[PDB]
Design a protein around this ligand. Structure first.
Ligand SMILES: CC(=O)N[C@H]1[C@H](O[C@H]2[C@@H](O)[C@@H](NC(C)=O)[C@H](O[C@H]3[C@H](O)[C@H]4N=C(N(C)C)O[C@H]4[C@@H]3CO)O[C@@H]2CO)O[C@H](CO)[C@@H](O)[C@H]1O
Ligand SMILES: CC(=O)N[C@H]1[C@H](O[C@H]2[C@@H](O)[C@@H](NC(C)=O)[C@H](O[C@H]3[C@H](O)[C@H]4N=C(N(C)C)O[C@H]4[C@@H]3CO)O[C@@H]2CO)O[C@H](CO)[C@@H](O)[C@H]1O
Length: 499
């Protein structure tokens, strides 16, 4: 049917732009020339990261950026479109460093969306940047607007959308229209900031790119998979913050949608989006990490899973103990807590003491270093089989990943994703999705199809009775009920009738 989106972020820090070279990996580890024609054909979007919002409340490059070098790098990316007429080079505004609550530019995000006049100035600057540098759309990665900033954020997205649509007409770009996307939270605590207005946030977007990773890390006391597809009952569980969002729903409605505690998984985040009315599955893009998160000080028994650990959370990494054995990139980056898939392959292949283990509930791999007590959670071509099948089964828009420089040299992770979506000879009809814990919540936007006897006036219905009435299947919350379903508080809408 419709091709699945494959959205790869291209992350290049300012110092690498200013010293850009394609022949010295100690200066630029992943230059644009490493995105070969074959890789360009497997991507639908490359998202250049990151631009910012400056104190003038406009989209802007980092002011330390050499503009001539910046244009040269972007030009190399947009030249890739010669190999793929569906490919878009987006640019992304924000990222954790600029836009987190304590980030260096945070107040500029709050203020740029605060008023109609600020939103107009900001929205115009976005489109100006995208036309001036040759980008194909705008991606916003503010992590994250708070519940009170959400209305301004929504209006800013609406205003950018209108201007982009004007630009599509002006440039006759109907075959490849300019797009607007955001990177969204992939876990319930950050998602709760804007969850109640999710339909308004998604309406002006082509896609919402869920960051369904970083679900574990040094900030948690217990090691865990950072991107489990489904839940493991032996793993940690979390309070479901969505049940406290300002939804106006009843106790039964909240309980049916927001089981708590719950397993913090990719499936949970996807279902939490689908549960809301007006959030179409085709706009939801599942993020996947091309890096692993590493922990030290883990005590064995379960391959390092669900263990206490002694991994610092500070930034910069607080000392020079680069304890992730074999991680040469970690020495370069002065941080043993993150390793690219590229590096993880070499760590597993070398004489470094890792076992590769597999959790058949979460459908994810992990590395365990028994001698030193190390645990690494990551994703690979095998976990991507289950995630790609889930994307197809749930009719999602596609996949997103952070970031291109972390795939191995041959681009095997990207090639795998492309194969699972597009290869005629690839068959996952027999791929067993396992018995891991599914997120069981149901909301107005994902009512299952059900059948039930028609409601009959005068009949006294016990608690739990199911009837069909005016297009839906309803269940009594208590008994005995005689009211017509939907006329009072006694009936829960639990399903839809097939047309
Ligand atoms: C250019 C720069 O600011 N470098 C910073 C550095 O910032 C990076 C790192 O913190 C990245 N962390 C990891 C594990 O890669 C971080 O990546 C985030 C990104 O911000 C989020 N946005 C997405 N999208 C898909 C849109 O994914 C996430 C990823 C993965 O979590 O990106 C920031 C830049 O925002 O941080 C260090 C420490 O402060 C700093 O020294 C400097 O090198
Ligand atoms: C204390 C610490 O180590 N701070 C890190 C910082 O960690 C952040 C980010 O990695 C967030 N990643 C995002 C926003 O993409 C991370 O958010 C993850 C989060 O942990 C998962 N959990 C949720 N919840 C709702 C609980 O959602 C997902 C999100 C992704 O949506 O939160 C941690 C801790 O706050 O990362 C930066 C850059 O990597 C690093 O410099 C350092 O400051």
């Amino acid at each position: 049917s419709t091709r699945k989106a494959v959205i790869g972020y291209y992350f290049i820090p300012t110092n690498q732009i200013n010293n850009y070279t394609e022949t010295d990996t100690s200066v630029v580890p992943f230059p644009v020339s490493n995105i070969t024609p074959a890789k360009a054909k497997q991507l639908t979007h490359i998202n250049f990261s990151f631009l910012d919002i400056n104190s003038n409340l406009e989209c802007a490059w980092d002011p330390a950026t050499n503009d001539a070098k910046a244009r040269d790098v972007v030009n190399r990316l947009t030249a890739l479109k010669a190999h793929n007429p569906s490919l878009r080079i987006m640019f992304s505004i924000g990222g954790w460093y600029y836009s987190n609550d304590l980030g260096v530019s945070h107040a500029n995000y709050v203020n740029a969306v605060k008023t109609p006049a600020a939103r107009t100035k900001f929205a115009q600057s976005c489109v100006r940047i995208m036309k001036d540098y040759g980008f194909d759309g705008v991606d916003i990665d503010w992590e994250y607007p708070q519940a009170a900033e959400v209305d301004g954020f929504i209006a800013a997205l609406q205003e950018i959308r209108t201007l982009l649509n004007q630009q599509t007409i002006a440039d006759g770009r109907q075959a490849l229209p300019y797009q607007l996307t955001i990177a969204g939270a992939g876990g319930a605590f950050f998602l709760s900031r804007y969850y109640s207005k999710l339909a308004q946030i998604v309406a002006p977007l082509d896609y919402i790119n869920l960051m369904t990773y970083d679900l574990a890390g040094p900030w948690e006391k217990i090691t865990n998979h950072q991107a489990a597809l489904f839940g493991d009952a032996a793993g940690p569980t979390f309070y479901n913050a969505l049940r406290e969002a300002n939804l106006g729903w009843s106790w039964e409605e909240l309980t049916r949608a927001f089981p708590s505690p719950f397993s913090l998984t990719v499936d949970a985040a996807v279902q939490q989006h689908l549960m809301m009315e007006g959030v179409p599955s085709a706009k939801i893009v599942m993020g996947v990490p091309f890096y692993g998160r590493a922990f030290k000080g883990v005590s064995g028994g379960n391959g390092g899973q669900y263990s206490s650990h002694s991994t610092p959370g500070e930034d910069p990494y607080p000392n020079a103990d680069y304890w992730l054995v074999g991680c040469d990139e970690c020495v370069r980056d002065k941080d043993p807590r993150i390793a690219s898939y590229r590096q993880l392959e070499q760590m597993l292949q070398g004489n470094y003491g890792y076992q590769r283990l597999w959790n058949d509930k979460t459908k994810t791999p992990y590395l365990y270093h028994a001698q030193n007590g190390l645990f690494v959670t990551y994703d690979d071509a095998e976990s991507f089989k289950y995630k790609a099948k889930y994307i197809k089964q749930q009719q999602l828009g596609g996949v997103m990943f952070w970031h291109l420089g972390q795939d191995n040299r041959n681009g095997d992770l990207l090639a795998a994703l492309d194969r699972y979506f597009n290869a005629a000879d690839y068959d996952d009809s027999q791929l067993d999705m396992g018995t891991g814990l599914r997120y069981t919540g149901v909301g107005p936007g994902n009512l299952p199809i059900m059948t039930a006897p028609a409601y009959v006036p005068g009949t006294t219905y016990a608690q739990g009775a199911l009837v069909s009435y005016q297009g839906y299947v309803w269940q009594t919350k208590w008994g005995y009920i005689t009211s017509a379903p939907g006329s009072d508080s006694a009936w829960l809408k639990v399903g839809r009738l097939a047309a």
